Amino acid sequence: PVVIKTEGPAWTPLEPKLITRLADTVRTKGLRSPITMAEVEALMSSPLLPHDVTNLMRVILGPAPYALWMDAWGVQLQTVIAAATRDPRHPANGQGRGERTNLNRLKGLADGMVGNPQGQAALLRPGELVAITASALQAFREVARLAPWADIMQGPSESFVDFANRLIKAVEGSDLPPSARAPVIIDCFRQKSQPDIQQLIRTAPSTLTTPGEIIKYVLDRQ
Amino acid sequence: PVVIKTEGPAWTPLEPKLITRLADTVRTKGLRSPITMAEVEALMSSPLLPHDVTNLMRVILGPAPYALWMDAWGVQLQTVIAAATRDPRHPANGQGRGERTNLNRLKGLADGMVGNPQGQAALLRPGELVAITASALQAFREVARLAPWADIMQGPSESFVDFANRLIKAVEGSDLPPSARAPVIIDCFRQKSQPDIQQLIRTAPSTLTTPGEIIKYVLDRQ
Amino acid sequence: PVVIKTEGPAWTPLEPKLITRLADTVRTKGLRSPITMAEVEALMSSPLLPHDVTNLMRVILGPAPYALWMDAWGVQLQTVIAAATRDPRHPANGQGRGERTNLNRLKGLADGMVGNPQGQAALLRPGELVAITASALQAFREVARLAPWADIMQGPSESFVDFANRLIKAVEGSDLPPSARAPVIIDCFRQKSQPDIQQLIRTAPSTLTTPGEIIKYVLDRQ
Amino acid sequence: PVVIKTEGPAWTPLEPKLITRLADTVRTKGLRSPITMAEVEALMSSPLLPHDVTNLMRVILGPAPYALWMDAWGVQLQTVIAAATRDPRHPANGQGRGERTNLNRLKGLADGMVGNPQGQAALLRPGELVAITASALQAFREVARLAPWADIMQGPSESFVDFANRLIKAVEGSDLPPSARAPVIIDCFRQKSQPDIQQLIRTAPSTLTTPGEIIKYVLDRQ
Amino acid sequence: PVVIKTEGPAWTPLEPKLITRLADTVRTKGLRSPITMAEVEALMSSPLLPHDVTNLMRVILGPAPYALWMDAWGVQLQTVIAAATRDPRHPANGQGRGERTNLNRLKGLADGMVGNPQGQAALLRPGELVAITASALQAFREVARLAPWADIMQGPSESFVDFANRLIKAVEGSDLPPSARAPVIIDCFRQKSQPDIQQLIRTAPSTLTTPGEIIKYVLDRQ
Amino acid sequence: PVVIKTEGPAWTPLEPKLITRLADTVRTKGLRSPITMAEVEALMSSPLLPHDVTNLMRVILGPAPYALWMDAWGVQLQTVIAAATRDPRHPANGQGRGERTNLNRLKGLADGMVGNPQGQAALLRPGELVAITASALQAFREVARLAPWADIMQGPSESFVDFANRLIKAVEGSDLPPSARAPVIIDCFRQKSQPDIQQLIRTAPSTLTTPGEIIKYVLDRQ
């Protein structure tokens, strides 16, 4: 992370203990655990430098997952670059004519950044760290994604709430665009729930358009 | 949370460890545990940004409970908006003519806030964070509520204090308006306690109008 | 708690972890445990706001004990009000003519304090927080008191020191005014201890007037 | 403890957790444990106010031990008062004519100190806190002392080092004036050690006058 | 580590607890554990002085491993010296004519540095600490390396991902120059994987040139 | 330890918890454990006052070991005094004519230092604390030393690395002057290792003069 000191931007390493701690969480709970995800997001709540993210991931992830994270990160950074190239006002760009970002800077490979977190802190702009961090985080999620919702049905002894949570987690972790998730989830609620639930949802008000709204409606009738 | 730095308002993430810790508390103790409630309230003792609350809840709550929290939060925020719309002096509103709050700001979706906790800290007013935080907390309580007081009776081997606590917890977690809770609780004490207790309470002074007052009176006579 | 910042008095929440921790202590050790008492006193060593004390107690205490604490606190606050009303120079009062304290302020219910720890910090005076805190603490002790010294006698296989500690704890936790405790304890030492101890104490110097003095005298003769 | 803030001396409570922690140490390890002693000394390394010491001891000690501590503390404070009365330049005294210390101040009972750690911090001088703290600590040691060295002999299967440590601990915890301890310990080494050790020590250089010097000499010959 | 204070650069020791903690990690998990490596890297994220690194390594490593670390460090420092000697603009050199670094300074043996972390902090330049730290870290990796990839083949019941991670770890820990690792790893994927995987990789696009790219391609087809 | 505050040098006690922690380490792991040594060195990384060192050692060491530490410390301090007496420019001496150090100051017994860590902090010079600390540390090592390398031979089922580490630890903990350790260790490698190792070392390059160099050479041939 970076903190503004008297002379200027300075590098401050992530606490070694939290890194080790997360490494354990990843190992004990798995990449797809809400605990892990929450902890990783927490550690990445403060803008990180390339040096921070690569060493963080290298440590908490296995050799293979780290290799996957690196490819995912590269792709994510490239999408940032494509956007920053198309829009001069992109926050990753500097205000000045010669301040557009590039892939070398985002990876901390540009002149004066190579293997130097202090130089990265001194040269990268706040907007670049935001992109670097969000990119690294998304890359982590992709790795966790790659670490079927359409076959999920409410079991005869399974409660609605358990089926709803199971189904929602599968859809949110799927390849669907986010905008398709709510309609897809509600369709599965209407079609794949047990007979009594299917009748509750059938006659629900037509204004209930989110999964949470439908869940409340059903739970209120149990 | 937000801290006022030299240049102005800045975002400071909630400690990752406390978030993970609460996630465990929720998982091990349950949503309706006084331990959980106490810990959540503690973590939400400092005004939070939309970014803080959504990521906090997404992490400590399961997919389903989080979907419920989101719907509850939306409702709570809307009640804030309704109040801020009716009263220009509402603390969530800015002093200036074009400073009334709106749902987009409270959700951190307004221009310059989207997915940016730093921008949220720079743009949201203290009063808006208070509303955002209180709203998020109430939404959490609602989720815990949805995670019967009228059938509770003092068992033949059950102590009064245990029946009183059991009954009070059921009434406080019920759908009654808060103003009805004390009269309802005292009525149940008078009618549903064991015969000896019913006689103690029968002749209690008419000035004892709270559950705590009646409990003391009974305990003093044991 | 309150800390004086640049702009003025500001609210700082009690650490969520210590609150949870105390909740555990109360649950595992009990209200009448010296461990609990010590920990509660420690947490209440810094002046607290109404918001701090009510949420602290609501969390660490069960529904019933909390209802009892609330009644006890009300009584304690009223005694403060009675004193502040009788003596204009009472520390809970402000120096100015219109600065006497009242029950609404002490409960954080006065204009601008309702459900707002920041406003409470900005409006309550240091002396009011002292009273609020001492009152809350005393209320806690009362609850622990209500959660017999006259029948305590030294058992035939019980050591004097154990009987002395047992007896002293019972007398200190009793309804006696504090000024009666030392004479009552020493009387019990003289009358209810085993025959050999009764003879040691019989001929003790007449200048030994505290329980600790008599204990030392006896222990010195063992 | 006291910290000098902008407006002046201010009270800062001892960390509740360390107090609870020590209470456990006292309970689990005992008063005469080097662990306890070390921890207590550590907690009392920073000058404490009357409020700090009494509440610290009340919490970590049982009712009886606390009553003993209070008597011991009173005696210790009186010795400080006797010294400060005889020597105007005593550090517990203020530089000014009307600044001699007295027992009421040291106990935090003087005008403006009663039950008020903030007032104690504002009124007590640094030298008074030093005396209050050293006195409280000595009182703790006395309590631990009261919680035989002359019969200790080296057992036939006991090593010299173990006998030496056993003996030294008994002599240091005894009623001997500190100046008598070294000669007494060395006499016991010469007379009460096993035959082979008695011969080693017999012909030791006459310049070895401390227990540590004699121990080294013996260990060097094993 | 070094922190810039008012008077200038000052030495601040690494937290004793993290050092002890890492010592345990090394002992319990081993030198070649990603946990250890991550923790060591974390502790060495802040520029260290010779005093910091030697005492850190002496403590966390056994006598033999420490002797190996010392030889490795010497070699690493010499490579730094060779580079700083060939390039006057090397960051380890001072801007002034008489400010080139030398082995004595890097080892903290130069005039005023010997056994004095405060003097080292006052005399060594930021660039020298960077070199000292990176050198110490590389020396640690070498020790871990010395604490076969060509025989690794995917087992008949072994998953591709497990074989890929196993193989990648062996190649990264090998004597190959880093530039040879990716081609060597991909060759092993093509030749030493199970028959079905060999067919997947055979017809992969010719643009997939990293191990991570090939892994993704295969995983996408499982 | 000492920290420079506004008014000047001030005493800050070592954290009670780390002291207790080390006491446990000493008790559980022993004085000759690399864990203990590392932890003690860590705690003594910041210049300590006489008050700090004596109370630190008194707490973490048993009565006997502490008595030994005190004698060792006295000897170490005297060597410092001998050096500071012979060289006026010795860092333990003040720049002024009447600023040479003496044993009373180093032990914190000089006027104004007796039993007063605050006075010690105000009167002792930085160089004196360095000497006091290094002396205390060396005294600790001596105690650990006194808490045979010539008979060590590589066992028939013992690996070279294990024999090398065993031997090196024995030689480093011996009475040899440090300058004799490397030649003595290498001689033992050549003469007391198993036959195959003896042949590896026999024909080693004549430039390999440290134990680490020879170890690497052997390990490279295994």
PDB file of N, CA and C in Angstrom, chain D residues 84-85 87-90 92-102 105 125:
ATOM      1  N   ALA D  84       9.130  11.860  53.825  1.00  0.00           N
ATOM      2  CA  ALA D  84       8.840  13.149  53.195  1.00  0.00           C
ATOM      3  C   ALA D  84       8.655  14.242  54.244  1.00  0.00           C
ATOM      4  N   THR D  85       8.310  13.838  55.464  1.00  0.00           N
ATOM      5  CA  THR D  85       8.118  14.790  56.555  1.00  0.00           C
ATOM      6  C   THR D  85       9.464  15.202  57.142  1.00  0.00           C
ATOM      7  N   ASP D  87      12.427  14.979  55.464  1.00  0.00           N
ATOM      8  CA  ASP D  87      13.255  15.628  54.456  1.00  0.00           C
ATOM      9  C   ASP D  87      12.416  16.445  53.492  1.00  0.00           C
ATOM     10  N   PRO D  88      12.480  17.781  53.610  1.00  0.00           N
ATOM     11  CA  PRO D  88      11.713  18.667  52.728  1.00  0.00           C
ATOM     12  C   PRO D  88      12.041  18.479  51.256  1.00  0.00           C
ATOM     13  N   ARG D  89      13.266  18.036  50.972  1.00  0.00           N
ATOM     14  CA  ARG D  89      13.712  17.815  49.599  1.00  0.00           C
ATOM     15  C   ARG D  89      13.293  16.452  49.047  1.00  0.00           C
ATOM     16  N   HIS D  90      12.522  15.701  49.825  1.00  0.00           N
ATOM     17  CA  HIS D  90      12.058  14.387  49.378  1.00  0.00           C
ATOM     18  C   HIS D  90      11.312  14.578  48.061  1.00  0.00           C
ATOM     19  N   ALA D  92       8.820  13.306  46.828  1.00  0.00           N
ATOM     20  CA  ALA D  92       7.363  13.291  46.889  1.00  0.00           C
ATOM     21  C   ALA D  92       6.828  14.679  47.252  1.00  0.00           C
ATOM     22  N   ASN D  93       7.707  15.565  47.709  1.00  0.00           N
ATOM     23  CA  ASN D  93       7.271  16.908  48.075  1.00  0.00           C
ATOM     24  C   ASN D  93       7.371  17.877  46.911  1.00  0.00           C
ATOM     25  N   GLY D  94       6.485  18.872  46.904  1.00  0.00           N
ATOM     26  CA  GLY D  94       6.518  19.881  45.864  1.00  0.00           C
ATOM     27  C   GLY D  94       7.581  20.890  46.262  1.00  0.00           C
ATOM     28  N   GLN D  95       8.066  21.678  45.310  1.00  0.00           N
ATOM     29  CA  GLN D  95       9.098  22.670  45.596  1.00  0.00           C
ATOM     30  C   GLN D  95       8.601  23.769  46.552  1.00  0.00           C
ATOM     31  N   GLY D  96       7.315  24.100  46.465  1.00  0.00           N
ATOM     32  CA  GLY D  96       6.748  25.148  47.300  1.00  0.00           C
ATOM     33  C   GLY D  96       6.420  24.833  48.752  1.00  0.00           C
ATOM     34  N   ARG D  97       6.535  25.862  49.591  1.00  0.00           N
ATOM     35  CA  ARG D  97       6.290  25.771  51.030  1.00  0.00           C
ATOM     36  C   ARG D  97       5.053  24.958  51.423  1.00  0.00           C
ATOM     37  N   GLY D  98       3.976  25.110  50.664  1.00  0.00           N
ATOM     38  CA  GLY D  98       2.764  24.368  50.967  1.00  0.00           C
ATOM     39  C   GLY D  98       2.582  23.214  49.999  1.00  0.00           C
ATOM     40  N   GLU D  99       3.652  22.460  49.766  1.00  0.00           N
ATOM     41  CA  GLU D  99       3.581  21.342  48.842  1.00  0.00           C
ATOM     42  C   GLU D  99       4.133  20.031  49.386  1.00  0.00           C
ATOM     43  N   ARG D 100       4.122  19.877  50.705  1.00  0.00           N
ATOM     44  CA  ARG D 100       4.599  18.634  51.288  1.00  0.00           C
ATOM     45  C   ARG D 100       3.490  17.635  51.023  1.00  0.00           C
ATOM     46  N   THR D 101       3.833  16.361  50.855  1.00  0.00           N
ATOM     47  CA  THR D 101       2.799  15.364  50.605  1.00  0.00           C
ATOM     48  C   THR D 101       2.205  14.931  51.932  1.00  0.00           C
ATOM     49  N   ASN D 102       1.070  14.250  51.861  1.00  0.00           N
ATOM     50  CA  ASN D 102       0.407  13.748  53.052  1.00  0.00           C
ATOM     51  C   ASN D 102      -0.291  12.463  52.627  1.00  0.00           C
ATOM     52  N   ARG D 105      -3.326  12.624  50.115  1.00  0.00           N
ATOM     53  CA  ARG D 105      -2.992  12.795  48.708  1.00  0.00           C
ATOM     54  C   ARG D 105      -2.530  11.461  48.118  1.00  0.00           C
ATOM     55  N   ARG D 125       1.747  15.050  41.987  1.00  0.00           N
ATOM     56  CA  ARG D 125       3.020  15.337  41.335  1.00  0.00           C
ATOM     57  C   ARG D 125       3.697  14.051  40.887  1.00  0.00           C
TER      58      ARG D 125
END
